[PDB]
Design a protein around this ligand. Structure first.
Ligand SMILES: Nc1nc2c(ncn2[C@@H]2O[C@H](COP(=O)(O)OP(=O)(O)O)[C@@H](O)[C@H]2O)c(=O)[nH]1
Ligand SMILES: Nc1nc(NCc2ccc3c(c2)OCO3)cc(-c2cccc3[nH]ccc23)n1
Ligand SMILES: Nc1nc(NCc2ccc3c(c2)OCO3)cc(-c2cccc3[nH]ccc23)n1
Ligand SMILES: [Ca+2]
Ligand SMILES: [Mg+2]
Lengths: 59, 422
């Protein structure tokens, strides 16, 4: 009866740790994808500023 | 006062138990309310073996009713004699055992076993002189098989010098509820080998073949099988339930019937299986016929260590002796030569309901190994592939325990074979 209790608890434990690891890893990956996209858009805003300056300093 | 305590566990155990109590209550003239309305003091003369005497001059079976699910005990309470049982003797859980010996023996069953033992102790405490215990159960399910053998083990531990007797319904693929029955049966036989003094092997295969072939019943129900079981059990308890020439208790019977402690598994039979009165030659020939045996085993494939024959009805004891001697003398090779006078005969004057004459047979035969071989093969066919094992290991059992149970049963078979060739 103790072995049975232990096996049920180990199944609960391992599923809890696997789920938590997956959800954390997923959160980190999603946030990194959005941060890379935003960083590319910020590089665009930087390039648009360098364009507007080039145009100002052409005059 | 030679009291017996009766225990019935699980669905099968409780249905056949109930039939047993209705049949013997009828023989003793006890109605469903527990009142005596018979015609003869012999009916009451040894009534205390199975019945307690209550205040209302009520006779109450000395019976404990056990299951891990409620269903069957509600059906008992609604059954025809259901009011005769003591309400406090109903001990039931709620979970069920799912046809799972490990649930009966180790997890679900262990939670209930103490409360069952408390009632056993309360019944024994008021016994003038407890002779011992009889249990009705099947081996193929989970509660009767797993929890029943747990109960048997605990009773042995607390009453180690008392006789423990079971009526044990052995599974067959011909009348099967689940595929796991051979596992549950193999695990249980090992327990019986260690902790009972006498086990009546009642094979649902044989009961089916009798209902179908002999009684001509095309679709036999559990009710039809249990009618045979209850009539057999009535026969086998006759010699202690009614007045007569024998001064016996379960221990003297065991000592006379069981030559080696592990070889205590008996083939029962019944005759007759119709209005034509049966002559003593006909009762005698039929009771020894394979077709009347309830543990689908051919007795011509082994040898008899011991035999008890119980005749019921008014008949010539001279004629009984002559016919019993005839069968022994003409078939001497099937009776071991190294146990002299190994066939014993009892006569009770009181016949069962409806029949005028009947015979019940109890054989301790080495041919019973065929039954265990059957089960062992079904066990191995699954266990070599570990099929359905996860049901059991999920309740904490290891594969090792199955290997040991299989080995114990092959050893039991080898022992029966040793004495059959001797
Ligand atoms: N002869 C007979 N066998 C039964 C009866 N009920 C169930 N069985 C057999 O018992 C096995 C199932 O065990 P069961 O008693 O239902 O399991 P449990 O109640 O959990 O112990 C199967 O082999 C069935 O064929 C019955 O009333 N009579
Ligand atoms: N059923 C049953 N009976 C037994 N009888 C012996 C006995 C002697 C004197 C007594 C007594 C009982 O009771 C009080 O005085 C032994 C066993 C057994 C089975 C399997 C393995 C075992 N390892 C040790 C023992 C044992 N099993
Ligand atoms: N062993 C054995 N034999 C039996 N048959 C008759 C017999 C008569 C005279 C004998 C004899 C046997 O052996 C020596 O002389 C019945 C029983 C039994 C089992 C289980 C519960 C029981 N409640 C009452 C009885 C009984 N147990
Ligand atoms: Ca539980
Ligand atoms: Mg069942």
């Amino acid at each position: 009866i103790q072995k049975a209790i232990e096996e049920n608890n180990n199944f609960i434990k391992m599923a809890k740790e696997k789920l938590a690891q997956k959800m954390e890893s997923n959160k980190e990956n999603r946030e990194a994808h959005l941060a890379a996209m935003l960083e590319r858009l910020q590089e665009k805003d930087k390039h648009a500023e360098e364009v507007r300056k080039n145009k100002e300093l052409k005059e | 006062m030679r009291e017996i305590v009766h225990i019935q566990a699980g669905q099968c155990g409780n249905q056949i138990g109930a039939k047993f109590w209705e049949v013997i209550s009828d023989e003793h003239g006890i109605d469903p309310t527990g009142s005596y309305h018979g015609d003869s003091d012999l009916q009451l003369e040894r009534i205390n073996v199975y019945y307690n005497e209550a205040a209302g001059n009520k006779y109450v079976p000395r019976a404990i009713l056990v299951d891990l699910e409620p269903g069957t005990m509600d059906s008992v309470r609604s059954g025809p004699f259901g009011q005769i049982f003591r309400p406090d003797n109903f001990v039931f859980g709620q979970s069920g055992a799912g046809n799972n010996w490990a649930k009966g023996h180790y997890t679900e069953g262990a939670e209930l076993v103490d409360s069952v033992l408390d009632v056993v102790r309360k019944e024994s405490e008021s016994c003038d002189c407890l002779q011992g215990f009889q249990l009705t159960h099947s081996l193929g399910g989970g509660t009767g098989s797993g929890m029943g053998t747990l109960l048997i083990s605990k009773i042995r531990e607390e009453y180690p010098d008392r006789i423990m007797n079971t009526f044990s319904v052995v599974p067959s693929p011909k009348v099967s509820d689940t595929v796991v029955e051979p596992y549950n049966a193999t695990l249980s036989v090992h327990q019986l080998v260690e902790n009972t003094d006498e086990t009546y092997c009642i094979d649902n295969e044989a009961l089916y073949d009798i209902c179908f072939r002999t009684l001509k019943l095309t679709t036999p129900t559990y009710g039809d099988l249990n009618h045979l079981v209850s009539a057999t059990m009535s026969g086998v308890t006759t010699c202690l339930r009614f007045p007569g020439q024998l001064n016996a208790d379960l221990r003297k019977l065991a000592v006379n019937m069981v030559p080696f402690p592990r070889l205590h598994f008996f083939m029962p039979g019944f005759a007759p299986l119709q209005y034509r009165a049966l002559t003593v030659p006909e009762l005698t020939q039929q009771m020894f016929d394979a077709k009347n045996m309830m543990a689908a085993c051919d007795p011509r494939h082994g040898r008899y260590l011991t035999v008890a024959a119980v005749f019921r009805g008014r008949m010539s004891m001279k004629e009984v002796d002559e016919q019993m001697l005839n069968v022994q003398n003409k078939n001497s090779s099937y009776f071991v030569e190294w146990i002299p006078n190994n066939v014993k005969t009892a006569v009770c004057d009181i016949p069962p309901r409806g029949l005028k004459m009947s015979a019940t047979f109890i054989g301790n035969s080495t041919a019973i190994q065929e039954l265990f071989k059957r089960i062992s093969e079904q066990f191995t066919a699954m266990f070599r592939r570990k099929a359905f094992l996860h049901w059991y290991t999920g309740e904490g059992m290891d594969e090792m325990e199955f290997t040991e149970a299989e080995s114990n049963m092959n050893d039991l078979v080898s022992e029966y074979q040793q004495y059959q060739d001797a």
